Amino acid sequence: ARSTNTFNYATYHTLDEIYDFMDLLVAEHPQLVSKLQIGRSYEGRPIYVLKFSTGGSNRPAIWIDLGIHSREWITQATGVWFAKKFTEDYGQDPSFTAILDSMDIFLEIVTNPDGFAFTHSQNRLWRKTRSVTSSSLCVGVDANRNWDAGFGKAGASSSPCSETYHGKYANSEVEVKSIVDFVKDHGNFKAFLSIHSYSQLLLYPYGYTTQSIPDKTELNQVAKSAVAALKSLYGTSYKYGSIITTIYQASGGSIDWSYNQGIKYSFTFELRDTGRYGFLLPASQIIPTAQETWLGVLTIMEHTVNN
Template identity: 65%
Template sequence: MPRVRSSGKLKIKGYVLTKGRTLPKFPVALSAHFTALSMPGSSLVIFIMGLKKSASNSPTSLPVTLRQPLRCVPVIKGKRSSSQSSARREPPMLTMATHIAGHQCGRPTRCSPSSMKHQVLRIKTRNEEQLQKLQFLETLDHLELDFWLNPSTPALPVDVRIPAHSLQAVKVFLESHGIEYSILIEDLQVVLDREKRDIVASQQMERSSSTFNYGTYHSLASIYQELDNLASEYGNIVSKIQIGESYEKRPLYALKFSTGRGNRPAIWLDAGIHSREWVTQASAMWIARKIASDYGNDPSTTSLLNNLDIFLLPVANPDGYEFTHTTNRMWRKTRSKNSGSLCIGVDPNRNWDAGFGGPGASSNPCSDSYRGPSANSEVEVKSVVNFIKNHGNIRAFLTLHSYSQLLMYPYGYKCTPPADNAELNTIGKAAANSIQSLHGTTYTVGSICTTIYQASGGSIDWSYDYGIKYSFAFELRDTGRYGFLLPAAQIIPTAEETWLGLKTIMEYVRDNPY
């Protein structure tokens, strides 16, 4: 956003909206003289009368009137809330909003805490027309919307995190189009603060007892230390290996569970490729100890390790995971730099060489689903690809995500059923039944394309096309009440039921070699 002084010239570049209609999508440069008024918020809302499309792209000078916004809010398509009844009879006007961080009465300051809160909305569309309205919202970068569940079909809900400065605008937009929504999280910061307090309290208890609490969320350093502990405690079957390093030179550590020698058939399991999905890394750590401690005690696990090796990568995106703990809890991507852009990171689950650059992946480096400059450009992805290829005997590729309670198989980059569709569906349903048997948690089973939406460059599409028939992606708890911020109290129940589903697939792999 442009930097604004108390008076002077403001330049806005973007798409122009007027009289409730979108003009052809051409870049417009608008120069407007203004005088800043004393305002309680941190945004200027500029009402511009009678804007016309110019034949050229040269700046147009227009007089403007500044009005105090109700909140720190941008405005979409000139729509105003019903509370602005006094302005209803005014002529149609283009309404543009500029978010000016820390501007009040000409002095740097901060928005009040109440205006800073983010909300997470659940939006339900009834038809394709409403769905297209949401997809339009996705294109408005200045709103800074974070879609937790993307608008793909009217049959599925859409969850979106909305910053305070966009909240009123988005709600008015939804209401004006008759689109139903509800509030999942009233104030995101309250949830984040509670999560942080729980982590600190757990860390204090761990320091006093010198034990790793599998029922809480941990830093990367703590996770890596526990990998060492597991390898030391169960050295007869567990070893820690490094398969590569991240963009910021953090090691990519995996645990190998094996009771034999040589290049035995193996199962690959990873978690945390999307860094903010904390329940996946936490569940992977619980599962690691479960596998190690059950060998020799549980007949099923013992049989698995007597016939197969298991490789478990608990943090597939260590840079992103560290960043979620230190800077931005909602970070999803890697932390690599993008040439020609100030925006950081690539979506590592759009970066695999499987329909790369196709539907469901963005070419915009600032997007959370940015595919990257080329397939396997991310060293985190390339490290796994190289490991799988060099091993040469991986028989199942399993990956943990959150959230939505789904168990999916290929394809995502296309909607053509895979050759093994019937078999994969049968295995998936058996695993979902095992998951449900413990705590009653229900999972939806199907291909990525038919279950959620078309998405290219995903890991299990690559593994399946590479020849690993048993390729599955889990979306763990929940279905949206907490989303990526699943309370720590649900970690162990989530891990317990997930292990039952994983074990069902692993047993099938053991019994059905190919």
Template identity: 55%
Template sequence: MRWILFIGALIGSSICGQEKFFGDQVFRINVRNGDEISKLSQLVNSNNLKLNFWKSPSSFNRPVDVLVPSVSLQAFKSFLRSQGLEYAVTIEDLQALLDNEDDEMQQNEGQERSSNNFNYGAYHSLEAIYHEMDNIAADFPDLARRVKIGHSFENRPMYVLKFSTGKGARRPAVWLNAGIHSREWISQATAIWTARKIVSDYQRDPAITSILEKMDIFLLPVANPDGYVYTQTQVSIPKWAGTRLRRSENGNPSFAGKGASDNPCSEVYHGPHANSEVEVKSVVDFIQKHGNFKCFIDLHSYSQLLMYPYGYSVKKAPDAEELDKVARLAAKALASVSGTEYQVGPTCTTVYPASGSSIDWAYDNGIKFAFTFELRDTGTYGFLLPANQIIPTAKETWLGLKTIMEHVRDNLY
């Protein structure tokens, strides 16, 4: 603790008001025992260095990734050396990556305006994503429809695409969720690519055709529209997890338990009460009103993980064996594209205890097949996955998603 106070004094108040990331670096620390986890955990709970943990200290086999402001570099390195902690710098200059990303987005926007074509290999604004949802519905009116399910805190609409062959009301359904953590841009990009893939492959791919003959698919590509806009207009992506709180900590299961914080400034703030955020409530209300969802899949990044309940407890879910089998089949299918390896397991023991997660809520509310994908990569770029990896990520993820949906199709309950 004395070291934390000392290094806080070294940087003083100069970091306040920092809006750019010139010279900021991302460190990877490989923890070897409980004592090292405890040392790093002290930094998590300290504001002196203004650190931003991309992967928090949780277990021996899970590296810690942390964004360190340039003014804190000397003090942070001194702390690591004094504690005998081994580290490597994975991103040397964060602003350089951000500048490159901004340039690519601006160039892509110009090309799209001139060609009137949506580039699925680029990151987009909320407006562009919503416009493309309209295009998909217009191109395939007999299969896709854009549905408003609610609005955000700042009154932005929340839209899902419903894919249905229209054969009966309240058919068994799959919910695909993305973008609940606004800085995880690869999840929103993968989701909108997936939307186009569903309509393009219907009646061409026997698997997706048979899935849609039996079930509807609802896809929410941007579950946190306010946060997504904020990352693109107010603050750069690396530091912003969401608006006001992380929505995945705001569900019902073991609300405010392990893995969540009661500090409103924390990235894992759970909110004043379960489902307190209007975005979460909109999803919960829609799913409960529908009443016949059989599968809930939440797309996140990063780490290359495929997880199932529970996050709030180490106890095994009643259907753990089946969920594990399905997840491993999905991970194998995903790996068949580019060799990308995913770790599989229950959330609590695969990463860390996580209270109020969306898949735990889904599972405890009768949606048996509940999974979380943590997409590419494992830390080379972290939340700043280059746009040239969007389509490779989406293509491999699609095979994993399709494997899960095929199992649901064949095992309706």
């Protein structure tokens, strides 16, 4: 256990193992990767983002978050694989090299660390944050119903004990506010991808309203192209479309907020599978899932650099 070359990418890891992995990666590739702390979780754990960059200052950027819902383990595992992949392909793959030569990538592998630690020690299916709610015996907020986009509208719950509880007010969760503040302060994000599981869907805005986004034709074509690239490897079938027309109303979601902040290429991926194993996806599917998802993500990044 001395390098990222001996790390086991084909198994699920604990929070500490993932945080340790980030430090190893930074130690091995200091000229390409840096670890930023953008805030703390409710319970006090650091919230880290890896910044991949070849230079410049405030270059156009791509945001990718994983694990905002703690039980979706395939997402944190895919994030760890992505981090290593970026360091292997820069300078080797012509397309990825061109992207990193012009844009920075910010990767948040464990967006909800308190919930992630809770899924390892007490409840494997925990989805929410672990914030304490006064007046309630229930804990946590659905961090993907806490954003300032149609906040509080249908598609979320005002019940603290609900799995889709939206919280007292928009950005009440420090895990969410941390990203909001970082993205707004940076001000030059061009793409915002939030990774979840499961269902095998690639979605664009909106989830809170049936109104079509002005960029619907373009984003729809980008999603169609990304799903085709993804499918080419193992034949995995994904559907794509707007959130509301594909999986129904959902309010306070992250990509609806990012699109409304002017970040055009805002998409959410729902990875494998479609329900056979669900959240308990076998570890043997980690690498194949990461590899095919990479093709879809790269396709989207290629479209942003050229746009």
